[PDB]
Amino acid sequence: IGLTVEDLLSLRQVVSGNPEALAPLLENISARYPQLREHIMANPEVFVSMLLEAVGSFQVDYTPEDDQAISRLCELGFERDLVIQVYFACDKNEEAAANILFSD
C-alpha cells in the first residue's frame, strides 16, 4: 500500500481521535489509492496492523494543482465523482484522463 507519510498520519489521527472525519477522508484516499481496494479485500489484517502501528483544526483537501485540474475536466461536461476517479487512475494525467472519459 503506497501510503505517503502525510496520508498515513491523517489516517491514524482520524481513526483514533476524529472518526467523524472517516467519510471525507476515505473518499479522498480510496480515490487517490486505487490499489487500496484489493489490499483491503485480500489482507485487511495488514491494513489493521499498519494503523495500530502508525503511532488545532484540520480538513481533507485535494492539492490545489489537482483541484484545478479536476474542475477543468468537469467543464468538459462530466460528473465530478467520475472525473476524480479517472484522474487519479491516469496517475494524475489531464490529457490521459480526458480521453478515458470521452473514448473509454
Binding site: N18, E20, E27, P44, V48, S57, Q59
Partner: protein
C-alpha cells in the same frame, strides 16, 4: 434480472468495498479508544469518585445460600455508579453533526463538496475531557467504562459500528430528526457477573438503565425513524486485556434472519474477511469467560426460532424450505420437518421448513473422489438425478488411500502423467505436496523424481505444484528459494 431503479453493478461493488473499508476503520477506532480508556493517569483520578461502600457492592462475597442475592449487590453497585456518574458529568454536548451514527451514500459522496473542518482531538484531550466531565454522549460512556475499570471490574466497551449500508441499492439515499437518531446509543458498557456467569448490559448515559439480556435488549434500535441512522449489524466488545469479540448475537433478536443479510458476513468471503479483522484486533487468548459467552450465544441461536417470511428463510444459516432443498440433497432418515411457515393471503399455502442439520449432501462417484473418497464394494445410491448420475452418501464411501512412492521417490501417475490431490488425504503416505507456481520448474530443473499435482479444474486440469517423496522436500525447497538462478 434487475429492477430499473437500482444502481449500476460497479456501484454495488464500490459500496461493498467502501462498507468494508469504513467498517475496519471504525473497529480499529474502537480498539484504540479502548486503550485510551485504560489510561493509568485516568484510572487514578476516576478511582476517587467511587465511595468505599459502592466499591464493595461491585465486588460481592459468594453468597452460599442464593447466588442471586450477590448478583443483586453487583447490580446495586452498578446502579450506584450510574448515579454518581451523572453528577460527575457536568457538561453534555450534542454531536457536532451525526456522531458515529450511520451516514447515507449521498452524504458520504457530498462530504467533499460540503467540506467540514475538524477539531483535532488527541489522547490527552480525551483524558482531560473525561476527568473534567465534559463531552458528547460517546465520550461520557467511554469514561464510565474507565471508572469501572479503575475499580477493577471487568467492564467492556461496546460499540455498535455504523458503516454505510452496502445492501442499499437505491441510487439515492436521503432523509431526518435529531431526537430520533439519539434515542439509542452507539456506545455502551458490559460488566461481567461471576455469580450468574452472564455479561450485564449497562447504559449509564442514554437509556440510563441496567439490564440482564436474555432474549430482548432495550438497546437495539426500534422503529423506522430510529433505525434510519442506526442499523444494528456489528456490535463489537473490547475488554481490559485487549480482547475483541463480535457480540451482536446478544443484541440482535433476529440475528440469523434479519441482521445476517445486512452484514458483509452473509456470504463466505465476508465471513472469512471479517474473521481476519476481529483476529487482528483480538490481542489475548481464549478464556473460561469466552466459553460461558459462547454457550449463551449457542442457546440464543437455538431460541431465535423459524422466521415468519419466505425471504427470511432464503439462504438462512440453520433452516431451509423444502423447495430450496437441492436436487443433490435428501432428508436424513429419521428426520422430518422442523416447523411450518404459512404464506399469508387468501390463496396462502403452508411450507415445510427443515433444519439444514437434517439435510444430507449426496455426491456422484466422481464428486466423492474430489473429496478423496471412493465407493465401498457394497454400495447402492440414495438417488438418481438425470441429465444419468447416481448419487451416494458419506456412509456409502470410504477414505481413498493412494499408493506409496517407491524407494526412488517414483509416484504412480495417471495416463497424462499427473497425480490428483483434492484433499491432504490424497497425498501418498511417504510424500508431501509442494504448492508453488515455481515448484514444477524447480523439480524439472533438479531432474529428480516427482509428479505434477492437479488440485482443481478449469471449465481443464489445474497444476498448483508437485508431490514429492518426503526426503526430496529439502532439495526442491532449495531450488524454489533460488529460482532466480534457474
Amino acid at each position: 434480472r434487475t429492477s430499473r431503479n437500482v444502481c449500476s453493478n460497479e456501484e454495488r461493488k464500490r459500496r461493498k468495498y467502501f462498507h468494508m473499508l469504513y467498517l475496519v476503520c471504525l473497529m480499529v477506532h474502537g480498539f484504540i479508544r479502548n486503550e485510551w480508556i485504560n489510561s493509568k493517569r485516568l484510572s487514578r483520578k476516576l478511582s476517587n469518585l467511587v465511595p468505599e461502600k459502592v466499591f464493595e457492592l461491585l465486588h460481592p462475597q459468594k453468597d452460599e445460600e442464593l447466588p442471586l442475592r450477590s448478583t443483586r449487590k453487583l447490580l446495586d453497585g452498578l446502579k450506584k455508579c450510574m448515579e454518581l456518574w451523572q453528577k460527575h458529568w457536568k457538561i453534555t454536548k450534542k454531536y457536532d453533526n451525526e456522531g458515529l451514527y450511520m451516514r447515507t451514500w449521498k452524504e458520504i459522496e457530498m462530504s467533499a463538496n460540503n467540506k467540514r473542518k475538524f477539531k483535532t482531538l488527541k489522547r490527552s484531550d480525551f483524558l482531560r475531557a473525561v476527568s473534567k466531565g465534559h463531552g458528547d454522549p460517546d465520550i461520557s460512556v467511554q469514561g464510565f467504562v474507565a471508572m469501572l475499570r479503575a475499580c477493577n471490574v471487568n467492564a467492556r466497551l461496546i460499540m455498535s459500528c455504523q458503516p454505510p449500508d452496502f445492501t442499499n441499492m437505491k441510487i439515492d439515499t436521503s432523509l431526518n430528526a435529531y431526537k430520533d437518531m439519539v434515542k439509542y446509543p452507539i456506545f455502551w458498557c458490559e460488566v461481567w457477573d461471576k455469580f450468574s456467569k452472564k455479561w450485564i448490559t449497562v447504559d449509564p448515559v442514554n437509556l440510563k438503565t441496567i439490564e440482564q439480556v436474555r432474549l430482548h435488549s432495550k438497546l437495539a434500535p426500534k422503529g423506522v425513524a430510529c433505525c434510519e441512522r442506526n442499523m444494528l449489524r456489528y456490535v463489537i466488545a473490547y475488554d481490559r486485556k485487549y480482547g475483541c469479540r463480535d457480540v451482536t448475537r446478544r443484541y440482535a433478536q433476529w440475528m440469523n434472519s434479519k441482521v445476517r443479510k445486512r452484514r458483509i458476513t452473509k456470504d463466505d468471503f465476508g465471513e472469512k474477511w471479517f474473521r481476519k479483522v476481529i483476529t487482528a484486533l483480538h490481542h489475548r487468548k481464549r478464556t473460561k469467560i469466552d466459553d460461558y459467552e459462547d454457550q449463551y450465544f449457542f442457546q440464543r441461536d437455538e431460541s431465535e426460532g423459524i422466521p415468519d417470511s419466505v425471504q427470511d428463510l432464503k439462504n438462512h444459516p440453520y433452516y431451509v424450505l423444502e423447495q430450496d432443498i437441492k436436487q443433490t440433497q435428501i432428508v436424513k432418515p429419521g428426520c422430518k420437518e422442523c416447523g411450518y411457515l404459512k404464506v399469508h393471503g387468501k390463496v396462502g399455502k403452508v411450507l415445510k421448513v427443515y433444519a439444514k442439520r437434517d439435510i444430507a449432501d449426496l455426491k456422484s462417484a466422481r464428486q466423492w473422489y474430489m473429496n478423496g473418497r471412493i465407493l465401498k464394494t457394497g454400495s447402492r445410491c440414495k438417488k438418481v438425478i438425470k441429465r444419468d448420475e447416481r448419487l451416494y452418501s458419506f456412509e456409502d464411501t470410504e477414505l481413498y488411500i493412494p499408493p506409496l512412492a517407491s524407494a526412488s521417490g517414483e509416484i504412480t501417475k495417471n495416463t497424462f502423467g499427473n497425480i490428483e490431490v483434492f484433499a491432504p488425504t490424497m497425498i501418498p503416505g511417504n510424500c508431501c505436496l509442494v504448492e508453488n507456481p515455481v515448484a514444477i520448474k524447480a523439480a524439472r530443473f533438479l531432474g529428480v523424481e516427482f509428479a505434477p499435482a492437479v488440485t482443481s479444474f478449469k471449465f481443464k486440469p489445474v497444476l498448483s505444484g508437485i508431490v514429492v517423496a518426503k526426503w526430496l522436500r529439502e532439495a526442491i525447497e532449495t531450488a524454489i528459494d533460488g529460482i532466480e538462478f534457474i
